[PDB]
Write a protein that binds this DNA or RNA. Sequence first.
RNA 1: CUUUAAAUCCUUUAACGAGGAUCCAUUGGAGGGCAAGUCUGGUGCCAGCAGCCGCGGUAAUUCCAGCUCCAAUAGCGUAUAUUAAAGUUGCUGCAGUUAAAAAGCUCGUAGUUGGAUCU
Lengths: 82, 129, 30, 218, 141, 180
Amino acid sequence: MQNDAGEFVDLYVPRKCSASNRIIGAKDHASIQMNVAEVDKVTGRFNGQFKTYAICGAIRRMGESDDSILRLAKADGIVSKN
Amino acid sequence: VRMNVLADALKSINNAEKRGKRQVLIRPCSKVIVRFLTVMMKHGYIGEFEIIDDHRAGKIVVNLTGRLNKCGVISPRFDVQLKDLEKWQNNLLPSRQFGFIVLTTSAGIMDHEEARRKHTGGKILGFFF
Amino acid sequence: TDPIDDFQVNWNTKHGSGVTRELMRELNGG
Amino acid sequence: EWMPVTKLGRLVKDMKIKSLEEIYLFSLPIKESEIIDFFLGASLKDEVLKIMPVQKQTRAGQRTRFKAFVAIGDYNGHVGLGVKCSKEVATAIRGAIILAKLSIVPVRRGYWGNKIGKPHTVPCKVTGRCGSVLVRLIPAPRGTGIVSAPVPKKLLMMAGIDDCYTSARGCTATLGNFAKATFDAISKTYSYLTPDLWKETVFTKSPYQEFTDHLVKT
Amino acid sequence: GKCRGLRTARKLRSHRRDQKWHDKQYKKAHLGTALKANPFGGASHAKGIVLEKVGVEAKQPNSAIRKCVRVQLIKNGKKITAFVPNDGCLNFIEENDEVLVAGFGRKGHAVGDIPGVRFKVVKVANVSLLALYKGKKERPR
Amino acid sequence: PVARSWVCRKTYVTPRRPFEKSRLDQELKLIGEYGLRNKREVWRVKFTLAKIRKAARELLTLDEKDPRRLFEGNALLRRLVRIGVLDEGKMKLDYILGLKIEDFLERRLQTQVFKLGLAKSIHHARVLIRQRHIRVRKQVVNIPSFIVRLDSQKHIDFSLRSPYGGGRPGRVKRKNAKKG
RNA sequence: CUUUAAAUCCUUUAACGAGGAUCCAUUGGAGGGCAAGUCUGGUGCCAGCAGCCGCGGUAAUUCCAGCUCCAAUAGCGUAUAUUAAAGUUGCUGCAGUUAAAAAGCUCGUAGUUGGAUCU
């Protein structure tokens, strides 16, 4: 992606799955980019900001997209620990 | 029977990476397995691993960063000279930019780039990319 | 002589091979 | 003109999708060829690889339709392949051109040795498969050209690959499977996780989210 | 599966050497039986004496009469049927004269619709059939 | 036993596919641009370039600080720079693989004679060279394939015995003036 | 007479030597593979062509010819042996349910291969 001169020569940088760290292909139409709303610590209202998790279609098909999103939310404090 | 425990370890790591798992349990452990894993981890492919000590032959739980495409063994361990190393890299590696051949040399177990740095040929153990 | 019409008519005759070549010329640099 | 039927088409027509790489980044499907006509435009060069007449046996005789294999792509990193079967050759060619436009994928180019200038070859060894036809692309040194059969050579030149090494196995005489395997190998270039792509992904707003207000303002 | 051991060289070599005899070309070129059955005896061409002219019927899908000559080779006395290629060229050949005969282009296999013919006439009476056909040379008196 | 030598070498290679449109068109373009006689001259320059690329590749496979790589790479780079197909600024093994066949065809004596104004066309250049009207330095050169070096580029003159750079009229002019 | 042991040859200098510059380039092809005519005449499953698929049974894109076209070119065609193509001998690197194929089954010597562990 970087030549010896240091200039970037890639067409684009593809997304990587937030669970498997695998590249999501340009024609992977089963992949998702879910936004999870962030909430105020004392009011519990939408902050206008969110957190994004990209799950590829292979994880969705095998059914571990739910567990992957749950673990990503748990490891981020959106979902309460234990 | 089970021969070449390194082949089993590398096949288990490859299969667990294909399945998208975060950890793989390898058994039995061995010195060569630990050295191969250390060479893998120095290059950022595999991450930290823990050696479980049962009193007969250890097991290793290896964390898996999703960076690994394929890890394989070469059987038999052909003796490789420094002049035949380039042919092995062309046969085994996806490109000249990334990918490593792990040799076992009298200077230790290391990748082909280090083996050329230390001016040592050896016996081919495997590869990873 | 329409190259496409010739192909649609007698691609399956004695002249199918030559008619295919004439069709490929009309479409691209074949 | 062109009245978009999809949200993505409406966003593309109202000049707020900067490049085709945003859609590739978010893996959205293209259902209107006019998006590709808008982005790649006159740089696209298509050609017909093969017109295969296929027959279906009936009581009265054989019903003949013609399948058109069309490869498209600007010679700079985008290539597509479309196959359409119709009762007539012209209709099949038009449909195959539309399908090849809809199937355009980004092609990742790399270097063989030292990274000087623009990337010229494939970033690594990639393999494409389609019904026993295996096509392998190997990085080649600068100035080698495409060392391949005419069909993979045409697809790779259309993809903008300057020089490559090629291996084929299986019934490559079936042009459709050969071309589809070459297309699969070409599209696998951007799915391959190389160490230069290990940097953690930084997510940007989707076109549907970043321009939701414009979509609802209609 | 195949054996992969550092000391398996003899097994691999012997297996390859034994399995090569199941290759049609290898067995043909190394057994030596096809060489003794070859009328030319490994030669590219041969000289023979025209015993008679024969017309062999073409194979079924198409109809014709192929103008051949039955020749007897000088080196070994074997009897050979050789195709006289072009039209009218059978008239350039007389009974009981020397002809140079080559293969038909498929290495002992019959070529085209001509059945059981794998030889063709190149020269007759020490002048090529093409020179006689094109009129560059006349038959010697 | 003889005191002769049988060291000979074919200077070209025939294409694998005899009839493909792209190669035929490209080679005819080259012949027309550089006024060559047949496809064999194109194939000869192609073979020269391919051998050079093979040598450069085999050197590039070696260690960067390999004495043989350094020596033979500098030798090859100097040889390429000397005939003017490679720029002195870009003298590295990786820039060899960027060379094209036209870089070598530009250095023929035919091309240099046409480009220096000595000839009206490239074909006029070929017939001028073949007719002993051209000299490089003090030596009359008769071969259109003469690869002009960089130091001999400025010494391609119009000979001294030819009517174009000499002064003795030729056969035709002398005969026609003799009929006055 | 430069050359050479007398000499031919290349080289060199002179005198003639080009306008159909007659000082006249050929060999194989023109359905596909494979580059280049379903133009014209003859032949009418005949003669023949055709490596293979196929062409010819009175409107032959394929034969015999005319013209035109293209491939290489002082060189082209053909027959054989051989190499690559052949990942169709596979060490790299094939295959063995149904396409050719795992022994009816199990012991077994040679062969091949062989678990962790020493700074």
